[PDB]
Design a protein around this ligand. Structure first.
Ligand SMILES: *[C@H](C)[C@H]1/C(=C/c2[nH]c(/C=C3N=C(/C=C4\NC(=O)C(CC)=C4C)C(C)=C\3CCC(=O)O)c(CCC(=O)O)c2C)NC(=O)[C@@H]1C
Ligand SMILES: *[C@H](C)[C@H]1/C(=C/c2[nH]c(/C=C3N=C(/C=C4\NC(=O)C(CC)=C4C)C(C)=C\3CCC(=O)O)c(CCC(=O)O)c2C)NC(=O)[C@@H]1C
Ligand SMILES: *[C@H](C)[C@H]1/C(=C/c2[nH]c(/C=C3N=C(/C=C4\NC(=O)C(CC)=C4C)C(C)=C\3CCC(=O)O)c(CCC(=O)O)c2C)NC(=O)[C@@H]1C
Ligand SMILES: *[C@H](C)[C@H]1/C(=C/c2[nH]c(/C=C3N=C(/C=C4\NC(=O)C(CC)=C4C)C(C)=C\3CCC(=O)O)c(CCC(=O)O)c2C)NC(=O)[C@@H]1C
Ligand SMILES: *[C@H](C)[C@H]1/C(=C/c2[nH]c(/C=C3N=C(/C=C4\NC(=O)C(CC)=C4C)C(C)=C\3CCC(=O)O)c(CCC(=O)O)c2C)NC(=O)[C@@H]1C
Ligand SMILES: *[C@H](C)[C@H]1/C(=C/c2[nH]c(/C=C3N=C(/C=C4\NC(=O)C(CC)=C4C)C(C)=C\3CCC(=O)O)c(CCC(=O)O)c2C)NC(=O)[C@@H]1C
Ligand SMILES: *[C@H](C)[C@H]1/C(=C/c2[nH]c(/C=C3N=C(/C=C4\NC(=O)C(CC)=C4C)C(C)=C\3CCC(=O)O)c(CCC(=O)O)c2C)NC(=O)[C@@H]1C
Ligand SMILES: *[C@H](C)[C@H]1/C(=C/c2[nH]c(/C=C3N=C(/C=C4\NC(=O)C(CC)=C4C)C(C)=C\3CCC(=O)O)c(CCC(=O)O)c2C)NC(=O)[C@@H]1C
Ligand SMILES: *[C@H](C)[C@H]1/C(=C/c2[nH]c(/C=C3N=C(/C=C4\NC(=O)C(CC)=C4C)C(C)=C\3CCC(=O)O)c(CCC(=O)O)c2C)NC(=O)[C@@H]1C
Ligand SMILES: *[C@H](C)[C@H]1/C(=C/c2[nH]c(/C=C3N=C(/C=C4\NC(=O)C(CC)=C4C)C(C)=C\3CCC(=O)O)c(CCC(=O)O)c2C)NC(=O)[C@@H]1C
Ligand SMILES: CCC1=C(C)/C(=C/C2=NC(=C\c3[nH]c(/C=C4\NC(=O)[C@H](C)[C@H]4CC)c(C)c3CCC(=O)O)/C(CCC(=O)O)=C2C)NC1=O
Lengths: 160, 193, 161, 159, 48, 48, 161, 161, 161, 159, 161
């Protein structure tokens, strides 16, 4: 895929440029942030299961979907939605490390609206669930790394 | 796969990029899932064989078929006993990034489309959006003196859809002097022929 | 477009054959059905606005689609969807009178899938709406007419899907 | 937004942004912070604005909430209030944008067609928006109210 | 403008390739500041 | 949004197995007309 | 695919409603018809080869199609056409057991039009063959079974046309 | 097209949420940057002709391109190339004011590769010209503005390549 | 695929006509040309690597394409382009032996334009390369063979463009 | 890069990143600043490295710059030096990435095929890279040189 | 389009070379041929209706095409086919005057194959008709003119096939 280091490289090779200070500055920035991004990722992995459950509760649960004639309805349907929420989390974490949005869209965003429209899944709800995951994640993560972590969540939300 | 029947029915009527996509579907039950795999396989079928002592023709398209059966993904999921089955919505999850294409590949009408679908889709995601009618590739008439000739969806499926918002503007080439083009100058039509 | 009568004629013309009794029988069959069809068409035309309203109520509205982030959210999108519904109804009525599905293929069906995919309109929901229209239409037209009406609605649905 | 509108006019003319156009952009960015406050005020008072406006509308038009009328019944009355809420949200968006364009795309194009299918009377909807304006004006300070009024008036004009 | 009858003003890239593309591109698609040996051997024979 | 769309396909999954469907699905995979045994199995299913 | 019983269940499940007696009656109706359907299916399976032969004789053979330059000319094409006929028969039998037209839509009807258009197979002739099979089938199955059998054959025909 | 203000609005509209403080903060952030952007835009507009001149001198002219057999040979082609350069500059300026790269995708970037390939215009040379313009622009705008300006220029370059 | 001999046969088969003298004459014409074609094919196979080298030198290499940001920049892309060139050469040789352009349509030509457009490979440059190969091939094969060889190269070029 | 590789392995396993994997990422980010300096040094000395290496190569292989040889002539000699420059740029990219993958995609895949069409001798190219390594090593401090050497060695191995 | 004189000019312009004796010789060659070409063109224009009639008689008419089920069956199709024949004749005449095949490529040849395939017009029959026209034209124009006329007819034929 593409991550912040390789992104800078890739822009330079197409120009045929050797690495400039401007480029070296962007690269330094990643390395400063990186140490805590590693910390924040570990926090999110440990509490993942909890994070999802809290998020579902805030939006997905106690909605029309849970009521019969909604997508959440049934255990089978309920399970699927949780898997999707777990998907969104792993990627967002993978995106937090690396620091490049693109990992997201190659693996998640490309095609999603087309599957969801085909399955009948409601796009808006998923967007709400993602925003919920964002708030829970931010608390666990802590304030400094929250800004970082929020970016990848927002990308996912606007993609859908 | 190596048999005479398998080519001519498949392979011989398709271009090489389309053959590797059908050969995915029937040998492994999935559609081709990424840009890097359709590239690895395109180099296998493309590659002139290393000369083989086995009279059984060396590599070529046979290489393609080998590479699929010899693949761990193949052997593991199917095993030696099972005949390959089509994995589908019910089984093995099914990924979103190739959804639309894959469901077309699974239908029996699939061998009717001759234009490759997977390579076009992968790498249409990496590219900026194309030069085409907003409502679709089929909506652009062929540009000839007289006659309205469109591509018909049924007579040979070759759809290219692209998401083009209300705001997007087509780039059109001026029939005439380039600087006449009205995007760069509003008065260009009121100029000398 | 083509109709039933012309379809028979065209088949004979390519053969170069003069019209024969077997051909005549097919034409005769159409002629009996014709009177029913005309009555059905008049019913549909008069109730067209309501048919669309009822069908939307059954499937499209009070749904995620109409809610924000849904395809039919915003007035512009809502208006587009009901315009499409009207198209389907008008063409189905034409097809029913004609006794031939060809007009649907020539006008509505050709390029619709591709258009919808570019737009991001959901095909399954559209199909649902068409099926809903069929049900409403079935009631108004009455049973004999309903069978004839249903096939064209189903044809549209199959094409889209 | 103001900036989008300016860019679009320039692109049509195929020219760089005019100094005058640029000046208007500068004024807008200064105004924005004040605009944000105006929007915030209306958001907080949103629930009450909708409620008060609804009551006024129903008094003004008994027919809409009558057995014949579209609004009649709890389900229908809720939907009518939901619509009023939607329009208020759009107005807030407009104030921050400094243009009616955001409002216009979401709410004013195809509105006639949508309501005609629903059979909702368009004039009654307009009255509801007018009612909301009056409530909103009272809570807003005079200069703030004038700004808000313009957006409200546009909506009324559109329907 | 009421006196000219309509004419074809613009055309799409694919339409343009249909008319001109037969036989493709003549040219080597020269770039600025490229080392190229093109034309050198002819210039030497012209000298000889 | 995405640069490219593969498109949307109307797909329906199966909420619950039924004996009716389960028997049919076996028949299709075989590509054989209803086997002798199942025919008996089906009508008892119809009566019961 | 879907069956009659499941179709009723699904409609009720979205409503959340326990099955109404009226709904139950429709299910009950199906259960009685099921015995007759099974008998019909066995008849069709045994006589399948003959049914196809008779239908071909009625429409396909002794025709321009079989003559050189016709779609069914050459052994390969002839064999393909009779294979398609068998498919239609088998699926119609499946549909009759199911009591639902959906399987026809899911397997046979979907992609058929496109396949045929690319191949240049004539749809009207195919439809003619399906109708011929229906007539032959009607005889063998007997009257009560015939009505049930006919609807699925007609469904296929309408889809193709 | 989209701008930062509208982007925030659109995100909220799909959620259906009223504007909130967090959203307001993003808007506020843009408003502070805005003043700088407006100053940069005015600089670019005034020096546009010179910017193009300098960039062409750096990359395009005095080269094989301008010499016979080169793409920019003949007056008509020369004029076209400088017109294209102006487009890129104007759109980048628009993007910088907007604070969003979307306009570049919707107007400039869409179908450019295909157009150029049909025309036979060399993409890499064009990219070179864009990069040259960026360098000149960076000087005039000054450092704070330059960072903002550079991203849009780079976006164009990446799209074309 | 099809060859000249089979093409004649197929035309007669659709007519249902037995082979006639006029048909025989066309076959006879092919048989005389055959010996020349075989010699040409052997020449091309032996010199294939050089043919590609020379053609690349004439059109592709020492260009924007090879320069950074060009389509053929990077080893991977360079290798891909020469692989494509080899394909064209091999297929043209096959076509020349066959005496029929059909194989080019069935394997090379079908879907290539669309693939290239998605990839962003420049079609006109590719066509240029094909034309260059033709010129080199013409020399090696000699005049009688060259005319035959040229038509297939031109066919490829026309298809791509 | 290191990070991409780790993520990719995790995604294949369909699991969150392992502690061990996370630790390797931590080590890499710490190393990065040192790596950046090494890359910067080579970039500044790039012009001289290429020049010195070229001379060494031409001394080692008279033939390449001889009438028979590919490199012979000013145009050709320039191209040979340009190639050396390209490889040096790739090496710098590698050092910052911490992986050969960036190098590998741009330079090592299809290299054989490209050079065979050109008819350039691959061993001579390898010698040039070796020469560049020696020059680069001298400018770099010992530990820095070892890091740089790995990437240089990979290139030599690849060709 | 382009003509022989302009073709020479254009080749020199890309080289940047002033016109040289070798170039002059090509121009001089054209000038001598010119007078003959003008006479030939006038002959063709006067006899155009007959040329088409004769060619149709030789290939198109009294054939399966004209018989029911043939491409040129029905008045509308017959008229279309003779209109196409006229186009080919007129364009070939234009090309002969010009001394360049380019106009054929720009107007007639571009997209014709694809159009014909969609229409289901038979290419080989069309080619046959073109060849027939050539033979008739050859007679009327006389030998010197015939050689020149033939190349353009052959160019059209090769394009279509
Ligand atoms: C608690 C001792 C009693 C009780 C109450 C209860 N239920 C839930 C949550 C759910 N129950 C269901 C229901 C079903 N889905 C199915 O597929 C079936 C089988 C036919 C059933 C019965 C589901 C899916 C949930 C989870 C989400 C939802 O509300 O739909 C809760 C809350 C737990 C939660 O929010 O996850 C409670 C308190 N159920 C009993 O029968 C107990 C006696
Ligand atoms: C209230 C002032 C008047 C009124 C309202 C009314 N509306 C409905 C139903 C709908 N109204 C809307 C409108 C919108 N959807 C949008 O996206 C927007 C812009 C963001 C608007 C304005 C929609 C979509 C519906 C359909 C229901 C749904 O959304 O699911 C009703 C009910 C109609 C019915 O009979 O079903 C009513 C009553 N009625 C009046 O007469 C008042 C003056
Ligand atoms: C004679 C050796 C034996 C024989 C012949 C026989 N054939 C038919 C009917 C048909 N024969 C064909 C065969 C072909 N069609 C093709 O395209 C080809 C390959 C080029 C062949 C060989 C066809 C299609 C028919 C169907 C009728 C039609 O032409 O439309 C019959 C008639 C019997 C029937 O129709 O059931 C007969 C008698 N049968 C014998 O007993 C001889 C030993
Ligand atoms: C016979 C009544 C008519 C006819 C048939 C015909 N069909 C083909 C070829 C194909 N038919 C199909 C169709 C299906 N595949 C399926 O899975 C289903 C649903 C279960 C159907 C109905 C397919 C896919 C093919 C192509 C595969 C193959 O090898 O046959 C032909 C041959 C056409 C050709 O030239 O290849 C024919 C002749 N055509 C007629 O003339 C009859 C009216
Ligand atoms: C001489 C009477 C005047 C004059 C000329 C002048 N020209 C340049 C530079 C260029 N002129 C051209 C012109 C052409 N290129 C074409 O394609 C055509 C048509 C075939 C023409 C006429 C070009 C391309 C250049 C740009 C540089 C290049 O060679 O690529 C200059 C110097 C450049 C500069 O202005 O700095 C000059 C001086 N100058 C006068 O004042 C005379 C009146
Ligand atoms: C300049 C750096 C390079 C160059 C340019 C060049 N361009 C053309 C012709 C066209 N350029 C465009 C491009 C655009 N039109 C748009 O709407 C957009 C997005 C806003 C772009 C970028 C178009 C469409 C044309 C052709 C038609 C027209 O302008 O109406 C030419 C002329 C080619 C010809 O012969 O027509 C040239 C030379 N060429 C170079 O060598 C430079 C590297
Ligand atoms: C060389 C003259 C020009 C050129 C070529 C080029 N092609 C690719 C990539 C691909 N080429 C194909 C095409 C084919 N598929 C087929 O079936 C056939 C006929 C048998 C062909 C010719 C395919 C499928 C690919 C993609 C495979 C892959 O990605 O590895 C490239 C690489 C582009 C990329 O982005 O990878 C290139 C460079 N392009 C030029 O610049 C020359 C003018
Ligand atoms: C120098 C050590 C050796 C040498 C070099 C040499 N190279 C060429 C020509 C080219 N070399 C390249 C190589 C690259 N392009 C890429 O994309 C990459 C990776 C980034 C590389 C390394 C290319 C593309 C060319 C083709 C020409 C062009 O630039 O367009 C030559 C001349 C070619 C010729 O034979 O005429 C030479 C001489 N030759 C030696 O003998 C040295 C040992
Ligand atoms: C008889 C009243 C007059 C007459 C007739 C005549 N016709 C031809 C030749 C042709 N006639 C047709 C006409 C048709 N083809 C169609 O498709 C239709 C509609 C279905 C028609 C009416 C055609 C196609 C031909 C061309 C040859 C062919 O049949 O394939 C001739 C001979 C022409 C010749 O000179 O060769 C004649 C004589 N001529 C009269 O003068 C009568 C008054
Ligand atoms: C005559 C020898 C053959 C023949 C011809 C035929 N053509 C058509 C229909 C069309 N012909 C064209 C062709 C062109 N359009 C262009 O722009 C050009 C270049 C100037 C050509 C040559 C077109 C587009 C049509 C369709 C639209 C129209 O006719 O106006 C037909 C009729 C097909 C139909 O169904 O209409 C026919 C019969 N057919 C033969 O069999 C002869 C061998
Ligand atoms: C890696 C990226 C990726 C995504 C995102 C993805 C989505 C995805 N969601 C699916 C299903 C599903 N997804 C949902 C999800 C939801 N329903 C709701 O109402 C909620 C709002 C929402 C989640 C909270 C449901 C309910 C299904 C089952 C379909 C059904 O029968 O309704 C499926 C079908 C796979 C299967 O169930 O076998 C996919 C492909 N797959 C991927 O590869």
């Amino acid at each position: 895929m593409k991550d912040a280091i390789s992104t800078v490289i890739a822009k330079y090779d197409s120009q045929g440029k050797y690495f400039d200070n401007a480029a070296v500055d962007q690269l330094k920035a990643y390395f400063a942030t990186g140490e805590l991004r590693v910390r924040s990722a570990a926090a999110i992995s440990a509490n993942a299961q909890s994070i999802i459950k809290e998020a579902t509760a805030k939006a997905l649960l106690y909605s029309s979907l849970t009521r019969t004639g909604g997508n959440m309805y049934y255990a089978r349907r309920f399970a699927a939605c949780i898997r999707d929420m777990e998907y969104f989390l792993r990627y967002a974490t993978f995106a937090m490390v690396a620091g490049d949005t693109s990992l997201l869209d190659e693996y998640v965003l490309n095609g999603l609206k087309e599957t969801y429209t085909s399955l009948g899944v409601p796009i808006d709800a998923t967007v709400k669930g993602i925003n919920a995951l964002r708030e829970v994640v931010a608390s666990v993560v802590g304030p400094e790394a929250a800004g970082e972590a929020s970016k990848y969540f927002d990308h996912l939300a606007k993609g859908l | 796969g190596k048999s005479e029947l398998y080519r001519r029915e498949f392979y011989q009527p398709f271009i090489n990029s389309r053959v590797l996509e059908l050969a995915f579907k029937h040998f492994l039950g999935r559609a081709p899932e990424s840009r890097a795999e359709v590239q690895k396989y395109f180099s296998i079928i493309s590659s002139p064989i290393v000369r083989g002592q086995s009279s059984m023709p060396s590599g070529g398209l046979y290489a393609l078929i080998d590479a699929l059966i010899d693949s761990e993904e193949y052997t593991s999921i199917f095993g030696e006993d099972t005949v390959p089955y089509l994995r589908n919505l019910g089984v093995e999850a099914q990924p979103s990034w190739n959804w639309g294409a894959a469901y077309d590949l699974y239908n029996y009408a699939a061998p009717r489309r001759k234009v490759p679908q997977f390579i076009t889709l992968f790498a249409d995601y990496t590219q900026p959006l194309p030069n085409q009618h907003p409502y679709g590739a089929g909506n652009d008439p062929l540009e000839i003196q007289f006659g309205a000739i469109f591509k018909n969806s049924t007579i040979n499926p070759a759809e290219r859809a692209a998401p083009i918002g209300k705001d997007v503007k087509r780039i059109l080439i001026r029939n005439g002097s380039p600087t006449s083009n009205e995007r760069g100058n509003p008065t260009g039509m009121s100029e000398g022929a | 477009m083509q109709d039933a009568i012309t379809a028979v004629i065209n088949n004979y013309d390519v053969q170069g054959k003069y019209l024969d009794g077997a051909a005549l029988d097919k034409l005769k069959a159409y002629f009996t059905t014709g009177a029913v069809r005309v009555r059905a068409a008049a019913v549909i035309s008069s109730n067209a606005t309501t048919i669309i309203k009822e069908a939307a109520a059954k499937a499209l509205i009070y749904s995620d689609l109409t809610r924000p982030g849904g395809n039919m959210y915003t007035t512009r999108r809502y208006a587009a969807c009901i315009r499409d519904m009207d198209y389907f109804l008008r063409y189905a009525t034409y097809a029913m009178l004609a006794g031939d599905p060809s007009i649907l293929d020539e006008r509505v069906l050709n390029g619709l899938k591709e258009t919808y995919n570019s737009l991001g309109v959901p095909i399954a929901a559209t199909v649902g709406g068409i099926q809903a229209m069929k049900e409403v239409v079935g009631g108004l037209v009455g049973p004999d007419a309903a069978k004839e009406a249903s096939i064209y609605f189903d044809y549209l649905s199959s094409g889209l899907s | 937004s103001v900036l989008t509108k300016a860019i679009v006019n320039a692109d049509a003319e195929a020219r760089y942004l005019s100094p005058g156009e640029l000046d208007r952009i500068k004024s807008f960015v200064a105004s924005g912070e004040r605009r944000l406050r105006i929007a915030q005020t209306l958001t907080e008072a949103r629930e009450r604005i909708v409620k008060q406006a609804g009551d006024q509308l129903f008094q003004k038009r008994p027919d809409v909430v009558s057995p014949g009328g579209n609004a009649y019944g709890e389900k229908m009355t809720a939907l009518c209030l939901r619509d009023l809420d939607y329009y208020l949200r759009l107005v807030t968006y407009g104030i921050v944008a400094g243009d009616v364009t955001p409002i216009e795309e979401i709410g004013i194009i195809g509105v006639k067609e949508m309501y005609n299918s629903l059979q909702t009377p368009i004039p009654a909807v307009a009255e509801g928006v007018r009612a909301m304006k009056n409530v909103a004006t009272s809570l807003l300070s005079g200069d703030d109210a004038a700004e808000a009024g313009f957006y409200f008036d546009y909506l009324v004009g559109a329907m | 403008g009421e006196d000219v009858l309509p004419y074809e003003r613009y055309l799409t890239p694919a339409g343009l390739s249909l008319r001109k593309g037969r036989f493709g591109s003549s040219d080597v698609l020269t770039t600025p500041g490229g080392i190229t040996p093109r034309g050198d051997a002819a210039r030497m024979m012209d000298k000889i | 949004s995405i640069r490219g769309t593969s498109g949307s396909t109307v797909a329906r999954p199966r909420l619950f197995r039924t004996v009716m469907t389960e028997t049919i699905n076996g028949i299709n995979a075989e590509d054989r007309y209803p086997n002798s045994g199942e025919v008996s199995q089906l009508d008892q299913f119809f009566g019961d």
